[PDB]
Design a binder for this molecule. Sequence first.
Ligand code: AGS
Lengths: 49, 380, 370, 455
Amino acid sequence: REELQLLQEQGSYVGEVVRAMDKKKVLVKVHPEGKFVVDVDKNIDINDV
Amino acid sequence: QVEDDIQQLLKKINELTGIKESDTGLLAADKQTLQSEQPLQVARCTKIINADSEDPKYIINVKQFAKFVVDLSDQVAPTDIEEGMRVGVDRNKYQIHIPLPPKIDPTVTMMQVEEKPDVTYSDVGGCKEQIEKLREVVETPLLHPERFVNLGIEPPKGVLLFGPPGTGKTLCARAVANRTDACFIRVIGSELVQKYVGEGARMVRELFEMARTKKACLIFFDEIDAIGGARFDDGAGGDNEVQRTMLELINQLDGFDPRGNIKVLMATNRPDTLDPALMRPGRLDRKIEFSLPDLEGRTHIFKIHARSMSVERDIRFELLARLCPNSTGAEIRSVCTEAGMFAIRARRKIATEKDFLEAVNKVIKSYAKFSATPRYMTYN
Amino acid sequence: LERIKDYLLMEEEFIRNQEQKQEEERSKVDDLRGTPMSVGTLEEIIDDNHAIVSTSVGSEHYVSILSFVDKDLLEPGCSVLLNHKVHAVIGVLMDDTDPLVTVMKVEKAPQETYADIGGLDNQIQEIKESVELPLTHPEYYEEMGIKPPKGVILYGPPGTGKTLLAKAVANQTSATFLRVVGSELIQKYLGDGPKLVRELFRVAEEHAPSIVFIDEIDAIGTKRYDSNSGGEREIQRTMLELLNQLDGFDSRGDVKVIMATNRIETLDPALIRPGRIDRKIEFPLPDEKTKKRIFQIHTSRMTLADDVTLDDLIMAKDDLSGADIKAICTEAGLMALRERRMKVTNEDFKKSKENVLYKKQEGTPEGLYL
Amino acid sequence: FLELSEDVEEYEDLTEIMSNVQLNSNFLALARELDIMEPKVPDDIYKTHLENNRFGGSGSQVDSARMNLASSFVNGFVNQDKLLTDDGNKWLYKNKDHGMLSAAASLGMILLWDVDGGLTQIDKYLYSSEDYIKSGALLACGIVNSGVRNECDPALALLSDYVLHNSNTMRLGSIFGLGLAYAGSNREDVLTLLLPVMGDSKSSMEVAGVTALACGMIAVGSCNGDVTSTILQTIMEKSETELKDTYARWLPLGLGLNHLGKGEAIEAILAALEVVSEPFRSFANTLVDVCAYAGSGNVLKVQQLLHICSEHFDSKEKEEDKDKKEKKDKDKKEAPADMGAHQGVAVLGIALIAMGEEIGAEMALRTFGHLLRYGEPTLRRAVPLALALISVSHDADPEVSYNSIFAARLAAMLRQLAQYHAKKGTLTLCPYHSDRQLMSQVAVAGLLTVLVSFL
Ligand SMILES: Nc1ncnc2c1ncn2[C@@H]1O[C@H](COP(=O)(O)OP(=O)(O)OP(O)(O)=S)[C@@H](O)[C@H]1O
């Protein structure tokens, strides 16, 4: 029951990854918006993106 | 199993090749001026609605948000912060600092030719009087503004061109663009066909903004069926906004102060899909078509398309023009290139009569022409 | 044993597909950028280190430039990298286009060369001379001042191997290649004809000498006259866009186009003119001489008891496609596989010849010339 | 194709046992020399008709005593007659020392036939006022033929200088050109001449250069090689003087040439025991490792290639990775590798070698798409050589593309070399590995015209 602060947080956004680029980043197009070159988390590979 | 051997040890050494890189895997103009520019500001360009009296008290819109009541900053030229001028407005002080150019739209600058492609007047043979009329349209009022004055007549500021596909419309276009001297503007018709509501209308606005900047400029339409001449509308209610754009084009085009020193050439393969809100003269003043040249023009197009290719110095073009019953310069040039391919089928230095004979075969008699073999005498 | 080799080759190719800076200067680049980068639109560049941009929402700002590479590479019309703090102009965006560019770009030559179809080598010789010769052996075109052809239309009865010719030329090439099923333009989107078109051919010009391959648009040749009383949709406007892209202005470059249709008279004759599209190639129901070659290819690596003669089946009936021959060569094999048998006898071919040929049914003469 | 197919040993063993028997003497006519070459050159003049506007146009490509000097070489390797041979005077007088070697040998290059005409054309340039004219002239005498052996003695007699006089440059052209001349069972008399050559040891590199390379051309195809006192002597006299590392590169050339002829040789282990040290002689170790391993299904040295390819010394990388076009030359579909995807720029040089000269498919020219575009002048220099070796508009399209690349002086020279190119037999295996130290003086390029691998 103490764990439930994680439920109390703003989750995330969806994003259209068109194609990745070099040097450990990707591109993301947000759902109504433009494209955004963004950074990744430690848990994900561009081979899997 | 020898192939098994072959492919297996090939891919095995390829696996080794992968393992190779797998094991072999192990500021002055850019950095010290950054933080100096970080206290700048993201201040927005705008567009001004009106000017109050005795004070700026300016009301303004940017694009979408609202209509913005602003000040000016103190270091302005308070004279020319009038309407129709995009200016820069702050995110804290809410005041005008620096003016800006208007919405220039430099994709409308992108349809200007910006070059001079070479197709000479000596290449467009066969139509020495149609191109004479278009020469009267283009060259003469831009060079000798006397006989219009000295006789009291008007220039044909619009000339439609129509006819079969293959004919020479493109050639006449780039031919007058070869000897132009003026500001020549190609117009893709689907540069008006943008997505959102009321924008190709503004594309016509951008056109007339470029037009009335300068003198003797040349707008060239082509493929105006893309723009359209069909008011195709009954109880289905589908595609109609392009017709709104095109009626906007008619409005700013002709009637109630038209263009001026602007000569517009248009082209269409489909004249029967036009609108009689442009068929009216005053708008389009010469409905010049082209037709198939009889023999002299077809021999002439032979001369133009064979002066710069290796042929025999004995061949004629009378008989070859004969075996083109109905043909164009595109088909003639296909005959030239096809006989060249036949010269590559042999190993020649030039082309001969029978080369062009079988090329005429390939083009016309081996056209599709349906269905198909005409083997009968009845004639000869 | 070879299956281990092929699996290891495919998985090592995937491993290679997985095998795809500055200690402090690159970190200064990481502070030359704000990490949530963005996509904008330059309207003007007043070159005094601050530019005016345009956004996908439409807010346009005097934003300062932070050059690491040459900042004069990007232009009005080329996008930028703006921050979320002051939307600072970061730098190098190599010019990216739509997602729908890699979609139409086949990255393989998954099938084989002219040794795959059986026998048409007069017009296979034509497409040979019009693609394989101008690319690989471009001597005589310069050496006799004659320009190579551009457009090739495939037509005729279907299932002749139009797809087979397509993929065969998709083998034997070093030029870059693109695969477009060109009828994809069924949206409810006004405009949007020229977007795919202009970006496709810009990409085609930017990469290399290439083939731009449109496939099966025989429906879209919409009669070039009207739509009847009220029609106009977009389709005429889109094909006219492609027409102007092909043989308008703005010189064609080293770009090739091969096209394929089933029915041909329903096309648009504003395209079929030479210069715009140069070659036209018949693919008819061939003969009874290369049917032997099509059976030969389709009996290359199958277990056939050589007592039987496929020429008996060729002597039986004379008008059917090579795809029909493939269907027979697989179907008689299934009829052999009814009861765990080694090879194929005659009667499996007979029942399979009858089975596949349930196509033409009409009716009632003729039959009665007679 | 008997004489084309045969190596250095069996035409001398063939001409000695057939010097005994011969049975009609027409195999002594054919199967030594002069009858592979008597039908060709007149029939070369007859069925082919080559025009003059590449002499004048490709021979017009401006001036600068380099590009012009190279052009003389380009004009010279034209072979419709030995016209560029007899084109007047004042062209070689503009020329300078090692290019005067190249032009004095260029009359050798126009005419690798005309035995009687070779003496009466080179004889004006024989014993002339200039050292480079006479030494490159005897070099040309070594170029034109391989069965005369009467050009030896006017050069052979002079050779001794004892440190660095004239006849050591005649030693370079004449030891090299006599290496072009004969391949006996083991010629020993010319190697007894070679003992005061390596014992001479001029500071000029190509003395010991054409010593190792020439005795290797004598010694390629040895009976599983040999570790004899010839190359053993040049190992010990090699490790005598550690100076001018081009010696430490081109002596293991001729070492590995004597190692050629192997089937099972343990000479890599023998020279491994004698030789290895600091990476000059470990580079000798990788040279013997290259040359002793011509190529089979022996992938263990290819994963050895994978590991020791990552060695921090980046010239044993150069030759050790350069062995690939020797090894997998038949199964050439695996020969496309990711050497361009690596970054040790000499490695891109290695693949750039590894394409080479055969018929050169679209994938090879596709690799010349990227390899054509590079900025370092030794690598941009390195691309047109194998680029126009692999093709001996279409052909001239990458050439005018190189005109689009530059328009340095090296690059201009490289372009000239490419133009020259435009227009397991060991004889084509040696001289380009002799070319592999190109990033150097034109004195080295005075021997650049000794890669005689084409009819
Ligand atoms: N007299 C001529 N001389 C040389 N080429 C000619 C001549 N007449 C026509 N042509 C050919 O026709 C082309 C110009 O006409 P077109 O290209 O058909 O114009 P167009 O835009 O294609 O017309 P449509 O109806 O829109 S397809 C030239 O590029 C040539 O291929």
